[PDB]
Design an enzyme around this catalytic site. Structure first.
Site, mmCIF file in Angstrom:
data_model
loop_
_atom_site.group_PDB
_atom_site.id
_atom_site.type_symbol
_atom_site.label_atom_id
_atom_site.label_comp_id
_atom_site.label_asym_id
_atom_site.label_seq_id
_atom_site.Cartn_x
_atom_site.Cartn_y
_atom_site.Cartn_z
ATOM 1 N N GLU A 188 -10.053 -23.176 5.578
ATOM 2 C CA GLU A 188 -9.774 -22.486 4.336
ATOM 3 C C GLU A 188 -8.348 -21.981 4.478
ATOM 4 O OE1 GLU A 188 -9.710 -18.735 2.296
ATOM 5 O OE2 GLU A 188 -8.468 -20.519 1.949
ATOM 6 N N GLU B 10 0.092 -22.435 1.046
ATOM 7 C CA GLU B 10 -0.171 -21.800 2.335
ATOM 8 C C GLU B 10 -0.093 -22.861 3.450
ATOM 9 O OE1 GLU B 10 -3.497 -19.062 2.565
ATOM 10 O OE2 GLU B 10 -2.530 -17.628 1.206
HETATM 11 N N1 LIG Z 1 -1.700 -23.663 11.760
HETATM 12 C C1 LIG Z 1 -2.689 -22.792 11.969
HETATM 13 N N2 LIG Z 1 -3.368 -22.849 13.137
HETATM 14 C C2 LIG Z 1 -4.390 -22.005 13.330
HETATM 15 N N3 LIG Z 1 -4.856 -21.055 12.513
HETATM 16 C C3 LIG Z 1 -4.161 -21.019 11.368
HETATM 17 C C4 LIG Z 1 -3.095 -21.834 11.022
HETATM 18 N N4 LIG Z 1 -2.633 -21.524 9.752
HETATM 19 C C5 LIG Z 1 -3.415 -20.543 9.368
HETATM 20 N N5 LIG Z 1 -4.361 -20.188 10.292
HETATM 21 C C6 LIG Z 1 -5.376 -19.160 10.133
HETATM 22 O O1 LIG Z 1 -6.312 -19.609 9.175
HETATM 23 C C7 LIG Z 1 -6.863 -18.474 8.472
HETATM 24 C C8 LIG Z 1 -6.771 -18.733 6.980
HETATM 25 C C9 LIG Z 1 -7.627 -17.822 6.107
HETATM 26 N N6 LIG Z 1 -7.294 -18.081 4.701
HETATM 27 C C10 LIG Z 1 -9.128 -18.025 6.311
HETATM 28 C C11 LIG Z 1 -9.793 -16.909 7.122
HETATM 29 C C12 LIG Z 1 -11.330 -17.151 7.303
HETATM 30 N N7 LIG Z 1 -11.583 -18.464 7.920
HETATM 31 C C13 LIG Z 1 -12.043 -17.017 5.962
HETATM 32 O O2 LIG Z 1 -12.480 -17.967 5.338
HETATM 33 O O3 LIG Z 1 -12.093 -15.781 5.557
HETATM 34 C C14 LIG Z 1 -6.102 -17.243 8.967
HETATM 35 O O4 LIG Z 1 -6.860 -16.482 9.896
HETATM 36 C C15 LIG Z 1 -4.845 -17.839 9.599
HETATM 37 O O5 LIG Z 1 -4.298 -17.070 10.664
HETATM 38 O O1 LIG Z 2 -4.679 -14.677 -3.902
HETATM 39 C C1 LIG Z 2 -4.558 -13.761 -3.087
HETATM 40 N N1 LIG Z 2 -4.083 -13.949 -1.852
HETATM 41 C C2 LIG Z 2 -3.735 -15.260 -1.326
HETATM 42 C C3 LIG Z 2 -4.965 -16.125 -1.068
HETATM 43 O O2 LIG Z 2 -4.555 -17.398 -0.569
HETATM 44 C C4 LIG Z 2 -5.996 -15.473 -0.133
HETATM 45 C C5 LIG Z 2 -5.454 -15.184 1.275
HETATM 46 C C6 LIG Z 2 -6.525 -14.906 2.304
HETATM 47 C C7 LIG Z 2 -6.211 -14.307 3.524
HETATM 48 C C8 LIG Z 2 -7.188 -14.092 4.484
HETATM 49 C C9 LIG Z 2 -8.485 -14.494 4.250
HETATM 50 C C10 LIG Z 2 -8.818 -15.092 3.045
HETATM 51 C C11 LIG Z 2 -7.857 -15.285 2.053
HETATM 52 C C12 LIG Z 2 -8.259 -15.793 0.692
HETATM 53 N N2 LIG Z 2 -7.147 -16.386 -0.055
HETATM 54 C C13 LIG Z 2 -4.926 -12.356 -3.446
HETATM 55 C C14 LIG Z 2 -4.050 -11.332 -3.106
HETATM 56 C C15 LIG Z 2 -4.454 -10.028 -3.294
HETATM 57 N N3 LIG Z 2 -5.652 -9.681 -3.786
HETATM 58 C C16 LIG Z 2 -6.492 -10.672 -4.121
HETATM 59 N N4 LIG Z 2 -7.717 -10.298 -4.611
HETATM 60 C C17 LIG Z 2 -8.139 -8.906 -4.719
HETATM 61 C C18 LIG Z 2 -8.743 -8.252 -3.458
HETATM 62 C C19 LIG Z 2 -9.756 -7.553 -4.367
HETATM 63 C C20 LIG Z 2 -9.460 -8.612 -5.458
HETATM 64 C C21 LIG Z 2 -6.165 -12.031 -3.992
#
Ligand SMILES: Nc1ncnc2c1ncn2[C@@H]1O[C@H](C[C@@H](N)CC[C@H](N)C(=O)O)[C@@H](O)[C@H]1O
Ligand SMILES: O=C(NC[C@@H](O)[C@@H]1Cc2ccccc2CN1)c1ccnc(NC2CCC2)c1
Ligand SMILES: Nc1ncnc2c1ncn2[C@@H]1O[C@H](C[C@@H](N)CC[C@H](N)C(=O)O)[C@@H](O)[C@H]1O
Ligand SMILES: O=C(NC[C@@H](O)[C@@H]1Cc2ccccc2CN1)c1ccnc(NC2CCC2)c1
Lengths: 306, 322, 302, 322
Positions: free
Chosen positions: D120, D129
C-alpha cells in the site's frame, strides 16, 4: 577502377538491380568530417560493398538521399544540395560521368521517380514542392506546391506517363494526373504516410506504409484501405514488389528488419540480418527468389525468400 | 550533473606541465610493470577514465613510445559532446589501439581488467570534483595488482584575511534563496588581494585503489593555525597536492606550486561574520566531508578564538551532485 | 545590414563557411548533425550505432562557433508527433542537439513552429533553458503565412478557401503566442519571421508588432527579376524590409540561386541597396538613438 | 526521504474499509493459487512490502485463516521507528510465521521468491508516493507466476473552480524561494468549497508486475474536458482507483468512492493565473510524469481555451525524492 574513391561511405541509401543483373549502390556519409556521397556499380553483387571489386564508382558533391535507373546507363540522383542530378555510365561501363546537375529545389531532394516513358522524372523535396523534369532538355516542365509539409515519397505509375503518387508529412496521399487543370486528388486523418508502391499488374492498385509500422493496400477507384497489417514496430521506410507473376511485397523499416508479405499482407519471411536501419531492397531479375537489402550498418545482405 | 563546454577543454589542454607530468608518471609505471625481456609480448591495458577531448590519451601513447612498451587503450568519457571529438580523433588518427567508450565510469561494464587506470578528476580542493566516488565505482575493473594514476591526493587549508573578498562574497546575495547562502559555499578564485595568516595544513587525504572492507569517503578534520599577527579572519584558502606516481607529483600549494600550472585556481571557503584575531592566538577550524547516495558536501566551523555558526549544514546551500 | 545564409547541405564546414564569407554573409545557419541522420535512443540494434554521431568541434576555432554559426534543429525531430516512439526519440534527440549547441557556444539556435501543437517542443525547450549554465538564443522559425494557407489550388477534391478568414489568417501568430506563453516569456526565446512570395493582409503583418523579432528569413524564390536579370523585391516586400530594418533584425537568405545567370551575392547586394536608400535619421532620432525600449525610472523632481 | 510519525500510522490504521478490502483480495488470491487438495502441503510465500506498524500483516494472517491456506510471511519496512513496533509485535504475538525485515524493498536481497507481494504505497494521485519505482525494484524477488496486490492503479483528473482555494495557495508564498513556487506544486486537500467543471477522466495507469523489456515510468497525457457552464478554472483535482485483485478495488473518485475510506484525500494541482472558461468551451490539460535516477515529478499545462505557462519545469518547485 580509375576516378573511383578508395573508400565507400558507411550509410548505404539505395540498391537497384539493372535488368542484366548489375547492382547500383547509393551511399552517403551522414557523420564525420565530410558529408558527401558516392555512386557504385557492381556487375558481381556478391562482391558488394567491397570498393576493390566494383565495376565503376564516383563521388558526388553531397549525400545521396535517393536514386533510380534511367534505362540501362542513366542514374538519376536526389541530392542533399537541392539538386536533381543525372549521371551516365560510359561506353565501357567503367566510369560514371555527370550529364546534368540542376539546383531547382530549395532544400534536400528526398525522392525521385522515373515516369513510364523513361524520358521524364518526378522529384519531391523538403522544400514542399514536386517537380516534373524533361531529362533530354535537362529542365523543369512543371512545379507543383500541393503539399503543406515535406514530400516523403513520389512514385511514378508503372505504365501511365501522366500518373504518379505522392505522400507527405501534411498527412496527404495525392494521386496525380497531369492532364487535369487541378492535377492532384486526395486519396479520416491518422498516422503519417511514409512509403508508396504501385502494384506491378493491377494498374489502379497501390500500397502505402506509415510512420507507425502499418502497411495498407488501396484501390484508387474505390478509395478505401480495407486491407492493412501491423508489420513493423517502427516507420515503414520502403515497399518493393517482387518480379513474379503473383508478386511478393518486401517491406523495410527503421526497426532494422525486412519482411516479405503476400497478396493478403500475411508474412512469409522475416530478416533481422541488419544491425541498423534497412534503407532499400531490390529483387534480382536473374533469380526471382533472391532479394538484396542495404542498410546504414554498411551491410549488403542477399536473402533467399521461400 | 553538468557537461563541460568545448572552450573549457580547449584552455586547460594548454597547461604546460600537467600533461608532461602525467606522461612521465605513465612512462615510469610501464617500465616498473613490464621488464625489457617482455617488451614485445606483454600488452598493458590502460584506461583513461574521463578522457575529455583526448589529451591524456595522447600522453599515454607518447609514454608507451618513450618506455618502448606495448599498450591497449580505453578512453572512457561521460560527456557525449566530448565523445564526438574522441570518436572523430579515433577514426582519423588513433585507430584500433584506442577504444572510445561513451559512459560514466561507475556504470561501465568493462570487457577486460586494466593494468593502469589514468584519471584527472581533481578539483581545487582535491576531492571536490568527486574523484573518490568516481574511482571507487571504477576500481572493480582494475586488476588485483593494478595501478591508479593518481595514487593519492591531499587537500590543504590556510586561514586568510581579505576585506576585498569578504565584500565580493557579500555581493553574491541572490533573490529566491536564503540571504546568507553565498557565505556557505566555496568559490574557485585566483586569490590576489589577501593575507595568508598561517602556513597551509593538510586537511583530507584519499588513496587509490581503496582495498578496505568498508569504504568511507566521509571525513572530519580539526586544524589549529598559529597566528603571529593582529588581523581579521574572512575565510580559508583551499589547495591540493597529488601523487601521480611515486615522485611524479602535482601541487597548487603556494610553497610547492607546480610551475606554470594554471589548471587549478585555489578554493575559498568563506565565513558569514568576520572574526578578530590577535597576535599569538590560534585559529581552530573544523571541516567535515559529508555524503548520501545522491550528493556530497562540506560543512565547516571556526571554534577558536571565537565560534562561528556551522556553515552549510546538511548541504542546505551547497552540494555536489552524484 | 547584419546578414546570414541558411543552408541545409554542408559537405565540408570550412569550405562552406569560406564560400559564404566570400559572398559577404556575416553568419551561416546550418545543421549541427546531418539533417537526414535519424538516431535511435531506446531500441536495439539501432540504439548501439557506432560513432561519431556528428563532426568534430575541432573543425572550427572557438571564435567561429561563438560568432559565425547559427545551429538548426534536425527536420525529423518531432516532439509533438502522434506516435509515442517518435515523441520519445525526438525529445532525446532535441536535448542532444541543443546540448551540442551549448557545448559549441553557438550564439543562436533555430527551431521551427510549423504546426499548431508545439506543447511538448515548448516543454523540452523550457527544460533545457532551466538545466545547466548557458546563455544561447532560441530563434523560433515561424512564417507570416502557414504553408497549408499558401498551397497552390491544385487538389481537385480539396479546394483552397476563397472566403476571408480574419482570425484564421493570423493563425501563425497564435502558434508563436502559445509557444512563448508555455515557455513563460523567456528572454532567450525570439522570432525568426519567414517571409513568403505573397504577403498577407496588413492585419496579419501588424500582429507581429511588439514581438521580439531577431531575424527575418528571405527565401530566394520571393525575389522578382528586373530587365538586367538581377533579383529585386515588389514594392510591398520593400515596405516590409524598411519596417524590419527599423527593428534592426538580422536578415537570413534561404534556398538555392533562382537567378543562375547572376552571382549569389546579388540577393545580398539588393538588401544593402535598400538599407543605403532608407530615410536618413532626423534631429529627434539623432539624439534618441540607443534609447529604444530602454526603461528609465522617472526622476524624483523634489 | 522522510519517515512517518507514530500517530500518522495510528490514524490510518482506523480506516474502516481499506484493510477489509486488502484481506478480501489476499483471501481470493490464496484460493485461486492453491486448491483444496494442496491446503496442508503448499505454503504460499507472502511479502508485505512497506509493512508500517503491521496492519497488512494482520490482514494477511486473517485472510489465510479465512481461506484455510498455509502462508509464510515477510514484513519489509524501511522506517526503522515502525520496525520497533513490528519487532515487538513479532516477539509477543506473531512468532516464527512472520519474518521482520528492516530494509528498503529496492535494496533487500530476499532469501526466497514470493508467491504474493502485498503493498500500500499509493498516493492521492496513485503513483505520487512512487509505488511504480518501489515495486519495480521489488519484482525481481517475485516468482515468474507471482501476483502483486495491487495489480493496477489509475489516476484521475478533473478541472475545478474555487476562488477560495486559489487564495489559500496564493497565501503559501514563502521567503527564500521563487515567489510563484506555491502554484507549481500539488497539495493534499479535502476539497470542499469548489465546483467540479467536468467529469474526472483517467490520466496515468501502472500495472504490477511490469514484464516489459524496457520499463518506463515516464508518462504524457492530453485531456479534453467539455465544460457546459460559464466559470473560472483554478486548478485540477486528482483522484485514483486501484485494482487490488480482480473485482476487489479501492477508489477515491467521487462517483465510485469506497465508503468510509478516509486514507486518501484528493490532490490539487494549481495554476498560476485563473483562466476564464465560457459555456461550451473545452479545457485542454497536458500532464507529464518525469524522472531521473534521483527524483520524480510532474509537469502540467493548460492549452485550451488559453495557454498557461508550463508548471513545475525540471521539478524546479516540486520533486519526490527517490
Ligand atoms: N521503498 C520502500 N521500501 C520499504 N518500505 C517502504 C518503501 N516505501 C515506502 N515504504 C513504507 O511503506 C509504508 C506505506 C504506507 N502507506 C502503508 C503502511 C501500512 N502498510 C498500512 O497499510 O497502513 C510506510 O510504512 C513506508 O515507510
Ligand atoms: O491523503 C492523505 N495522505 C496521503 C495518503 O497517501 C495516505 C498516507 C499514509 C501514510 C501512512 C499510512 C497510510 C497512509 C494512507 N494514505 C491524507 C492526509 C491527511 N489526512 C488524511 N485523512 C484524514 C485523517 C482523518 C481524515 C488523508
Ligand atoms: N564519473 C565519470 N565518468 C566518466 N567521465 C567522467 C566522470 N566524471 C568526470 N568525467 C570526465 O572526466 C573529465 C575530467 C577533466 N578534469 C579531465 C579532462 C581531460 N582528461 C584532461 O586532462 O584535460 C571530464 O571530461 C569529465 O566529463
Ligand atoms: O580551478 C579551476 N577550475 C576547476 C579545476 O578543477 C579544473 C577543471 C577542468 C575542467 C576540464 C579540464 C581540465 C580541468 C582542470 N581543472 C579554474 C577555473 C577557471 N580558470 C582557471 N584557470 C584559468 C584559465 C586561464 C587560467 C582554473
Amino acid at each position: 577502377p580509375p576516378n573511383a574513391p578508395a573508400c565507400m561511405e558507411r550509410q548505404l541509401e539505395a540498391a537497384r538491380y539493372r535488368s542484366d543483373g548489375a547492382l547500383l549502390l547509393g551511399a552517403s556519409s551522414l557523420s564525420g568530417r565530410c558529408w558527401a556521397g558516392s555512386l557504385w556499380l557492381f556487375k558481381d553483387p556478391c562482391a558488394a560493398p567491397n570498393e576493390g571489386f566494383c565495376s565503376a564508382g564516383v563521388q558526388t558533391e553531397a549525400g545521396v538521399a535517393d536514386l533510380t535507373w534511367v534505362g540501362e546507363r542513366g542514374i538519376l540522383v536526389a541530392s542533399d544540395s537541392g539538386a536533381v542530378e543525372l549521371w551516365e555510365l560510359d561506353e565501357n561501363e567503367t566510369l560514371i560521368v555527370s550529364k546534368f546537375c540542376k539546383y531547382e529545389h530549395d532544400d534536400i531532394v528526398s525522392t525521385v521517380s522515373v515516369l513510364s516513358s523513361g524520358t521524364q522524372a518526378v522529384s519531391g523535396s523538403k522544400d514542399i514542392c514536386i517537380k516534373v523534369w524533361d531529362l533530354a532538355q535537362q529542365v523543369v516542365l512543371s512545379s507543383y506546391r500541393a503539399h503543406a509539409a515535406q514530400v516523403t515519397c513520389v512514385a511514378a505509375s508503372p505504365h501511365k506517363d501522366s500518373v504518379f503518387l505522392s505522400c507527405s508529412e501534411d498527412n496527404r496521399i495525392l494521386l496525380w494526373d497531369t492532364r487535369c487543370p487541378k492535377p492532384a486528388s486526395q486519396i479520416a486523418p491518422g498516422y503519417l504516410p511514409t512509403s508508396l508502391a504501385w502494384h506491378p499488374q493491377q494498374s489502379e492498385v497501390f500500397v502505402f506504409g506509415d510512420e507507425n509500422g502499418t502497411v495498407s493496400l488501396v484501390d484508387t477507384k474505390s478509395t478505401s484501405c480495407v486491407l492493412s497489417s501491423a508489420v513493423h514496430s517502427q516507420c515503414v521506410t520502403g515497399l518493393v514488389f517482387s518480379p513474379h507473376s503473383v508478386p511478393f511485397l518486401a517491406s523495410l523499416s527503421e526497426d532494422c528488419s525486412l519482411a516479405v508479405l503476400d497478396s493478403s499482407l500475411s508474412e512469409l519471411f522475416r530478416s533481422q540480418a541488419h544491425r541498423d536501419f534497412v534503407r532499400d531492397a531490390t529483387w534480382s531479375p536473374l533469380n526471382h527468389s533472391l532479394l538484396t537489402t542495404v542498410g546504414w550498418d554498411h551491410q549488403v545482405v542477399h536473402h533467399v525468400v521461400p | 550533473m553538468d557537461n563541460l563546454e568545448s572552450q573549457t577543454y580547449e584552455v586547460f589542454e594548454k597547461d604546460p606541465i600537467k600533461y608532461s607530468q602525467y606522461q612521465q608518471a605513465i612512462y615510469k609505471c610501464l617500465l616498473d610493470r613490464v621488464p625489457e625481456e617482455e617488451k614485445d609480448t606483454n600488452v598493458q591495458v590502460l584506461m583513461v577514465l574521463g578522457a575529455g577531448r583526448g589529451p591524456l590519451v595522447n600522453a599515454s601513447l607518447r609514454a608507451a613510445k618513450q618506455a618502448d612498451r606495448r599498450i591497449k587503450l580505453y578512453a572512457v568519457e561521460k560527456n557525449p559532446n566530448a565523445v564526438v571529438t574522441l570518436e572523430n580523433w579515433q577514426f582519423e588518427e588513433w585507430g584500433s589501439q584506442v577504444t572510445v567508450v561513451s559512459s560514466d565510469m561507475r556504470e561501465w561494464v568493462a570487457p577486460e581488467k586494466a593494468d593502469i587506470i589514468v584519471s584527472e578528476l581533481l578539483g581545487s580542493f582535491a576531492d571536490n570534483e568527486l574523484s573518490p566516488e568516481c574511482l571507487d565505482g571504477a576500481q572493480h575493473f582494475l586488476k588485483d595488482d593494478g595501478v591508479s594514476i593518481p595514487g593519492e591526493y591531499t587537500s590543504f587549508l590556510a586561514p586568510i584575511s581579505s576585506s576585498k573578498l569578504y565584500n565580493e562574497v557579500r555581493a553574491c546575495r541572490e533573490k529566491d534563496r536564503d540571504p546568507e547562502a553565498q557565505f556557505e559555499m566555496p568559490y574557485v578564485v585566483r586569490l590576489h588581494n589577501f593575507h595568508q595568516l598561517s602556513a597551509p595544513q593538510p586537511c583530507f587525504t584519499f588513496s587509490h585503489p581503496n582495498r578496505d572492507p568498508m569504504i568511507d569517503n566521509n571525513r572530519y578534520c580539526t586544524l589549529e593555525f598559529p597566528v603571529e599577527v593582529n588581523t581579521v579572519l574572512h575565510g580559508f584558502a583551499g589547495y591540493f597536492e597529488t601523487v601521480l606516481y611515486q615522485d611524479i607529483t602535482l601541487s597548487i600549494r603556494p610553497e610547492t606550486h607546480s610551475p606554470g600550472m594554471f589548471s587549478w585556481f585555489p578554493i575559498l571557503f568563506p565565513i558569514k561574520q568576520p572574526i578578530t584575531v590577535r597576535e599569538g592566538q590560534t585559529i581552530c577550524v573544523r571541516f567535515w566531508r559529508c555524503s548520501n547516495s545522491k550528493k556530497v558536501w562540506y560543512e565547516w566551523a571556526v571554534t577558536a578564538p571565537v565560534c562561528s555558526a556551522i556553515h552549510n549544514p546538511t548541504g542546505r546551500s551547497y552540494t555536489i551532485g552524484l | 545590414v547584419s546578414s546570414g545564409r541558411d543552408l541545409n547541405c554542408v559537405p565540408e564546414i570550412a569550405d562552406t563557411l569560406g564560400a559564404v564569407a566570400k559572398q559577404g554573409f556575416d553568419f551561416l545557419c546550418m545543421p549541427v548533425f546531418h539533417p537526414r541522420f535519424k538516431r535511435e535512443f531506446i531500441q536495439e540494434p539501432a540504439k548501439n550505432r557506432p560513432g561519431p554521431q556528428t563532426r568534430s568541434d575541432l573543425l572550427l576555432s572557438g571564435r567561429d562557433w561563438n560568432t559565425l554559426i547559427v545551429g538548426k534543429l534536425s527536420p525529423w525531430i518531432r516532439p509533438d508527433s502522434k506516435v509515442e516512439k517518435i515523441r520519445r526519440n525526438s525529445e532525446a534527440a532535441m536535448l542532444q542537439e541543443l546540448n551540442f549547441g551549448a557545448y559549441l557556444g553557438l550564439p543562436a539556435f533555430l527551431l521551427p513552429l510549423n504546426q499548431e501543437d508545439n506543447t511538448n517542443l515548448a516543454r523540452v525547450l523550457t527544460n533545457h533553458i532551466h538545466t545547466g549554465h548557458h546563455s544561447s538564443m532560441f530563434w523560433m522559425r515561424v512564417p507570416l503565412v502557414a504553408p497549408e494557407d499558401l498551397r497552390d489550388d491544385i487538389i481537385e477534391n480539396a479546394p483552397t478557401t476563397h472566403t476571408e478568414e480574419y482570425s484564421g489568417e493570423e493563425k501563425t501568430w497564435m502558434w508563436w503566442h502559445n509557444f512563448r506563453t508555455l515557455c513563460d516569456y523567456s528572454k532567450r526565446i525570439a522570432v525568426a519571421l519567414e517571409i513568403g512570395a505573397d504577403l498577407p493582409s496588413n492585419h496579419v503583418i501588424d500582429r507581429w508588432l511588439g514581438e521580439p523579432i531577431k531575424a527575418a528569413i528571405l527565401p530566394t524564390s520571393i525575389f522578382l527579376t528586373n530587365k538586367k536579370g538581377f533579383p529585386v523585391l515588389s514594392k510591398m516586400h520593400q515596405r516590409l524590409i524598411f519596417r524590419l530594418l527599423k527593428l534592426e533584425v538580422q536578415f537570413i537568405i534561404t534556398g538555392t540561386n533562382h537567378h543562375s545567370e547572376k552571382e549569389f551575392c546579388s540577393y545580398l547586394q539588393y538588401l544593402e541597396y535598400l538599407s543605403q536608400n532608407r530615410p536618413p535619421p532626423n534631429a529627434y532620432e539623432l539624439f534618441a538613438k540607443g534609447y529604444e525600449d530602454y526603461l528609465q525610472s522617472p526622476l524624483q523632481p523634489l
